[PDB]
């Protein structure tokens, strides 16, 4: 898994 979820959207 990743820790930089700030840079990504689900869809």
């Amino acid at each position: 898994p990743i820790y930089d979820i700030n840079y990504y959207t689900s869809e």
Partner: antibody
Amino acid sequence: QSLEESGGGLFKPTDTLTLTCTVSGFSLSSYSIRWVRQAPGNGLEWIGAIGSGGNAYYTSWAKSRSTITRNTNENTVTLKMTSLTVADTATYFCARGGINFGIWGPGTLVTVSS
Amino acid sequence: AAVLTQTPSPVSAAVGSTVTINCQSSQSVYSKNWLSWFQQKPGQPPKQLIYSASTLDSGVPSRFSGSGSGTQFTLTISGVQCDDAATYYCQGTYGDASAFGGGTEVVVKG
């Protein structure tokens, strides 16, 4: 979980800076890596970052003369910044992103001087 | 282009008093709580004191407290000590960037 900057030292105006951030004890595929600099006696400034998927982000002044890349097999992240001026004189840090932003490298001093 | 603005520097504080450093973000930080506080002493690298707006980092003294959410954040230093003389920075993360406040220098009168 640690980071180490290398590539600092003395540069002339117009030269290219190439800093390497070498990481240990965590995977680049799970974290962002951010680049921050601090001019002598001044504030911290975010330059840019690369995400867990290898895409980079940059501040307005950096975007047009900076490239941030990585090598996941060699555990490195690279900052390349062209057209150095004396105002680029600073300590440059890499640091591991995520909500817990506590793990930084020790910093490497970049001096731009004739 | 989110910008962080903090308490103007310098803050002069008598030992044992309570210091407050305020930090305002021009846009909400990611998920409202991606906001760290950093301490830096001249000639040393910055140290994270607080992450997630209000979580104390390991080994950081109980004197420090972070609060706030969204765009408005506060660091307080309860019973400020000589060891707390330093410059403090708020640090926000957003959808496509991170940023630091300008820093607030705390000068402790002993």
